[PDB]
Amino acid sequence: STRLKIVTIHQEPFVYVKPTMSDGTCKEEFTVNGDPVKKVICTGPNHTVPQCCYGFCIDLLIKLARTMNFTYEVHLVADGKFGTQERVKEWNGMMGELLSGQADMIVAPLTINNERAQYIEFSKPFKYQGLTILVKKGTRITGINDPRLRNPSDKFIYATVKQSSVDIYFRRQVELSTMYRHMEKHNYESAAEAIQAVRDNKLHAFIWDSAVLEFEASQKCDLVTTGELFFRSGFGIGMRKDSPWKQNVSLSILKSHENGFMEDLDKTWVRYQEC
Amino acid sequence: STRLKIVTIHQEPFVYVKPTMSDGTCKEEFTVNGDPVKKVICTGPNHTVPQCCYGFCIDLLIKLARTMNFTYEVHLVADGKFGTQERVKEWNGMMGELLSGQADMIVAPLTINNERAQYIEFSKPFKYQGLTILVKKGTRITGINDPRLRNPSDKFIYATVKQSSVDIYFRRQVELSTMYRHMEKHNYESAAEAIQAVRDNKLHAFIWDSAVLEFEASQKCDLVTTGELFFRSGFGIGMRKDSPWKQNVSLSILKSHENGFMEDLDKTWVRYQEC
């Protein structure tokens, strides 16, 4: 009947965003084994214009749309954010768009957490992840229990992104009190700057989402992730409560974990051999 | 109004099962730091009798019951099984008990998968896991892509449990065809026997649930798990579809991942230092 409004956000390798060619089409590209890269037009801010979206999440959308037989239009979130609750409390970003009806589904690396789940519903997770630690190659940190994290000094500086979900996690547990006070002093304004600081040896360890950090390490051989994951979670498709789509989207995702499909998406988008 | 009927199954460290003392009570025990071990009476086959249940899942039940203010009675599944669909197709084990009304909730290390999710609903996961590989200490296997798994010979024998979810997973993907044919020749009748065979160097690698194998390695220093997890999944509380309990059980579980509670259960039940 009517096309679902899909909202997404720019985050490689889940969603790449590139300009259209001069004729308005998306450049034809192929995988190493000759398969066409599937691309969709996604409108959004560069001024709102049609752009080209592809990646793990786009391939997943396409699989869901074809399996469940729905049609869709994809756009990039207008304010460029995942969504937090803020005073004007109302959700902004993709959460706000989903709740307002500007979107019908959020298809993106959207972490399942208590706060969001109070307002929306999630599919079963299409990818598992957690927090991990990004360091310079050669640096050894066992995880959140490493003595250089538990007993901080300026000889080994670690941090996360100010006001992020990570910042909030450390703030909330008394046993991490000592780590939180160190981080509160070194936290960065954005993940990109924290990542650069590790490359530049101004930050010894950056604590962040594993799906982000592992992707950085796969592309930049002077960086690596280290240690046991902690605060595990999953990424799910977001829908308003009592969605007609949730059950079948969840069943498709579970089937895909079990039949190789999700693994094929990981081989296609997440796995590299440069480093 | 009425007590929820909780069904569970014996699997350390999630559910320990021990006899009552001579007077019918459960032995008072304490953690290393002095805290009482919480125990519940769980009736079930040793002839159905009251026994003592405690562990990660029992602590979780207790937290849910107190948070949501419900009361409950726990029993061990009558046929001793998680549940498969079989001809008489009807579910047996905990699935069958849940569907028949003999249980209202399954509180156990119950893997979320497509087949079960067709019939029941799950809470958000209280523990993440996957498949991993159990080997003798000193043996090195990178994961499911290790050359000694991909290119099998009788110099390095690996196997799983016949007719298990693992057996079925390998059967279903063409790219694992060669591994499946090796395993089909060495598979064991039960996880206990496969585990013993690794200890006895009759089986070089056993492919199984990480929550099981990691627990074995934590208790038996001649065994270790090795390699990257694969076929990740989660354990969830099982309820009949459209349960009044699901939303609040899921919200509690998500909060517990975020506030230290789940981590405390891992420190209490899963973490050891002998090995």
Curated annotation (Swiss-Prot), chains A, B:
<comment type="function">
    <text>Component of N-methyl-D-aspartate (NMDA) receptors (NMDARs) that function as heterotetrameric, ligand-gated cation channels with high calcium permeability and voltage-dependent block by Mg(2+). NMDARs participate in synaptic plasticity for learning and memory formation by contributing to the long-term potentiation (LTP). Channel activation requires binding of the neurotransmitter L-glutamate to the GluN2 subunit, glycine or D-serine binding to the GluN1 subunit, plus membrane depolarization to eliminate channel inhibition by Mg(2+).</text>
</comment>
<feature type="disulfide bond">
    <location>
        <begin position="26"/>
        <end position="52"/>
    </location>
</feature>
<feature type="glycosylation site" description="N-linked (GlcNAc...) asparagine">
    <location>
        <position position="151"/>
    </location>
</feature>
<feature type="glycosylation site" description="N-linked (GlcNAc...) asparagine">
    <location>
        <position position="46"/>
    </location>
</feature>
<feature type="binding site">
    <location>
        <position position="209"/>
    </location>
    <ligand>
        <name>glycine</name>
    </ligand>
</feature>
<comment type="subunit">
    <text>Heterotetramer; the NMDAR subunits are modular and harbor tiered domains that function in concert to regulate opening and closing of the cation-selective ion channel pore. Forms heterotetrameric channels composed of two GluN1/zeta subunits (GRIN1), and two identical GluN2/epsilon subunits (GRIN2A, GRIN2B, GRIN2C or GRIN2D) or GluN3 subunits (GRIN3A or GRIN3B) (in vitro). Can also form heterotetrameric channels that contain at least two GluN1 subunits and at least two different GluN2 subunits (or a combination of one GluN2 and one GluN3 subunits) (in vitro).</text>
</comment>
<comment type="similarity">
    <text>Belongs to the glutamate-gated ion channel (TC 1.A.10.1) family. NR1/GRIN1 subfamily.</text>
</comment>
<feature type="glycosylation site" description="N-linked (GlcNAc...) asparagine">
    <location>
        <position position="69"/>
    </location>
</feature>
<feature type="binding site">
    <location>
        <position position="111"/>
    </location>
    <ligand>
        <name>glycine</name>
    </ligand>
</feature>
<feature type="binding site">
    <location>
        <position position="116"/>
    </location>
    <ligand>
        <name>glycine</name>
    </ligand>
</feature>
<feature type="glycosylation site" description="N-linked (GlcNAc...) asparagine">
    <location>
        <position position="248"/>
    </location>
</feature>
<feature type="topological domain" description="Extracellular">
    <location>
        <begin position="140"/>
        <end position="275"/>
    </location>
</feature>
<feature type="disulfide bond">
    <location>
        <begin position="221"/>
        <end position="275"/>
    </location>
</feature>
<feature type="disulfide bond">
    <location>
        <begin position="42"/>
        <end position="53"/>
    </location>
</feature>
<feature type="binding site">
    <location>
        <position position="109"/>
    </location>
    <ligand>
        <name>glycine</name>
    </ligand>
</feature>
<protein>
    <recommendedName>
        <fullName>Glutamate receptor ionotropic, NMDA 1</fullName>
    </recommendedName>
</protein>
<feature type="binding site">
    <location>
        <position position="165"/>
    </location>
    <ligand>
        <name>glycine</name>
    </ligand>
</feature>
